Design a binder for this molecule. Structure first.
Ligand SMILES: CCC[C@H]1CN(Cc2ccc(CN3C(=N)N[C@](CCC4CCCCC4)(CC4CCCCC4)C3=O)cc2)C(=O)N1
Length: 390
């Protein structure tokens, strides 16, 4: 591991997000910031909110610069609005550099901040094309790379605990690593396999085959990427296009048929519980997503376990049972490889070479019989046809 200063710099969990400490302004104001590979704005709470115990105070920063422009960002289940400006930004457990970056000072929001998440802002790590108000507002990572010698690449190791963490525990536990400018070899086992970034807006990739316990879902592969497939640390679940979700759930139900679960469990709404230590991992199937490789007609696969797609949650009765929610859900906006999938792997966002790498994570949860995997190569033809075009 050559990046010790950045190893173990994340905290959090899949359901509320993983965050990194950052500082903004002069003198530095410390804030915890959500790592979000699914957006491209650096936006921080800048006014009192019931769920924030701190926020960015522009009037206290000598280096604050007002851009005299507002920004409104509505999204699926909420929105955030703010005032744009720039200031000096640093990451204490990151590269030892300070850069001048755009900051959206959030003045109003709806269903954005999460009670008990411990973060006060978000770091959009995707490309300018999806930055708001438009692509002229340079994203943080672009600024970092342009102003310093930091390589144009970052990598993420999100570590799920495999069991519920109470408030004190989640504040004291290490949730993973965000390595800025490099790859730390202590964070993964086996080899790294790369898939091309299809287009630079979201971190878009192409899935070419899907298996449930080795059985091919056998759908037209364009269905797997309708209308896109992205890697998003800001989403909790593995989200799949409606038809793919329906096919996958049918296959997962068939594989786990020795136990019957209520419809609410499969809808990802209700938890299922087992007596302490008796979770029947073995009856649930592994899921393999084959991704386009860097070589023509070549693919590789990433395989996750139920220890990744069953999200630990505390029982309504705080009992001693081990409980979980099904963390695979349907989408009308494409496939989303959320945090529960990322928890199985060390993911390298190699912006410089327009590719995303995957390797088995040194902190993935598993049992004595099965482990997550990243394997290849496999001969796969006409993979370009798996991409969807409007
Ligand atoms: C952290 C875990 C939270 C829960 C909520 N939750 C549902 C959910 C639904 C959609 C998205 C996609 N997504 C995203 N990655 N960032 C934003 C802006 C996208 C951006 C794209 C370009 C155009 C402008 C908006 C803001 C979010 C970021 C997370 C905090 C809330 C606001 C967004 O909507 C993520 C999560 C989930 O699963 N776990």
């Amino acid at each position: 591991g050559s990046f010790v200063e950045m190893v173990d710099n994340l905290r959090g969990k899949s359901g509320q997000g993983y965050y990194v400490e950052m500082t903004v302004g002069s003198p530095p104001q410390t804030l915890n910031i959500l790592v979000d590979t699914g957006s491209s704005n650096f936006a921080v709470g800048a006014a009192p909110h019931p769920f924030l115990h701190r926020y960015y105070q522009r009037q206290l920063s000598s280096t604050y610069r007002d851009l005299r422009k507002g920004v409104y960002v509505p999204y699926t289940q909420g929105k955030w609005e703010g005032e744009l400006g720039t200031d000096l930004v640093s990451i204490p457990h990151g590269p030892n550099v300070t850069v001048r970056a755009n900051i959206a000072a959030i003045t109003e929001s709806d269903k954005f901040f999460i009670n008990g998440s411990n973060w006060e802002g978000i770091l959009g790590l995707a490309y300018a094309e999806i930055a708001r108000p438009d692509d002229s507002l340079e994203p943080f990572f672009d600024s970092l790379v342009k102003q310093t010698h930091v390589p144009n690449l970052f990598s993420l190791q999100l570590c799920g605990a495999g069991f519920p963490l109470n408030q004190s525990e989640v504040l004291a536990s290490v949730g993973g690593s965000m390595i800025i400018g490099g790859i730390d070899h202590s964070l993964y086992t086996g080899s790294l396999w790369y898939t091309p970034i299809r287009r630079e807006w979201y971190y878009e990739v192409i899935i070419v085959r899907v298996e449930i316990n080795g059985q091919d879902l056998k759908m037209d592969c364009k269905e797997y990427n309708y209308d896109k497939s992205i890697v998003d640390s800001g989403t909790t679940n593995l989200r799949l296009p409606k038809k793919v979700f329906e096919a996958a759930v049918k296959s997962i139900k068939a594989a786990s048929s020795t136990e019957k679960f209520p419809d609410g469990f499969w809808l990802g709404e209700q938890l299922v519980c087992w007596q302490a230590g008796t979770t029947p991992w073995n009856i649930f199937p592994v899921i393999s997503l084959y991704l386009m490789g860097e070589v023509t007609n070549q693919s590789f696969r990433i395989t996750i376990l139920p220890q990744q797609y069953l999200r630990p949650v505390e029982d309504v009765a705080t009992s001693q049972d081990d409980c979980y929610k099904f963390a695979i859900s349907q989408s009308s906006t494409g496939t989303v490889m959320g945090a529960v999938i990322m928890e199985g792997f060390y993911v390298v966002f190699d912006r410089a070479r327009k590719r995303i790498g995957f390797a088995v994570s040194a902190c993935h949860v598993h049992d004595e019989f099965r482990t997550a995997a990243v394997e290849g190569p496999f001969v796969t033809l006409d993979m370009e046809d798996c991409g969807y075009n409007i």
